[PDB]
UniProtKB/Swiss-Prot annotation, chains A, B:
Protein name from the UniProt record: T-cell surface antigen CD2
Shown residues within the full chain: 26 to 121 of 344
Domain of life of the organism encoding this protein: Eukaryota
Glycan attachment positions: N72, N79
Subunit structure: Interacts with CD48. Interacts with CD58 (LFA-3). Interacts with CD2AP. Interacts with PSTPIP1. Interacts with FCGR3A; this interaction modulates NK cell activation and cytotoxicity.
Region (CD58 binding region 2): 72-86
Record's subcellular location: Cell membrane
Function statement: CD2 interacts with lymphocyte function-associated antigen CD58 (LFA-3) and CD48/BCM1 to mediate adhesion between T-cells and other cell types. CD2 is implicated in the triggering of T-cells, the cytoplasmic domain is implicated in the signaling function.
Region (CD58 binding region 1): 31-41
Residue ranges constituting the Ig-like V-type domain according to the UniProt record: 1-94
């Protein structure tokens, strides 16, 4: 639909016929190629072979030769300043 | 710097000398160009000119000529499914 705003004023872009429930994982707003806002509750995970622990550690459920390599962890504070950036060379014994 | 795992076993990659607090906004794990896992408590916002409301709506704080256009909202359920995709053409009167 079409919504009207006026200069100097603010406005809320209402998600039509929709209500926020505990069954919603992500709400994403974009304007063209631009990401305006996005909310996501559960963490991103590549697959079920991985998982992130409460302390921030990466759990790799079942190791295979292809899980070896350098893994980079980066932590940002609440105002998004990068307070940590480490590399862990994961070697797998065969 | 070097962590050893073995085939058929799982493993936890430990963030060294780091404790998880309510003050950290995001933890990102990558392996090369692959995003493996990521946690982010706060919502993504382009700038302070915006804010995502508790109901998923997009609030544009102060309207200017450059805020006009089509805004896409997409909502995913707790399991990645897509339950909504609406387009909203915002027009600003001067």
């Amino acid at each position: 639909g079409t919504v009207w705003g006026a200069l100097g004023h603010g406005i809320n872009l209402n998600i039509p016929n929709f209500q926020m429930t505990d069954d919603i994982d992500e709400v994403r707003w974009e304007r063209g190629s631009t990401l305006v806002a996005e909310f996501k509750r559960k963490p991103f995970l590549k697959s079920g072979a991985f998982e992130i622990l409460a302390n921030g550690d990466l759990k790799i459920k079942n190791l295979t030769r292809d899980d070896s390599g350098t893994y980079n962890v980066t932590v940002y504070s609440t105002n998004g300043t990068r307070i940590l950036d480490k590399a862990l060379d994961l070697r797998i014994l065969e």
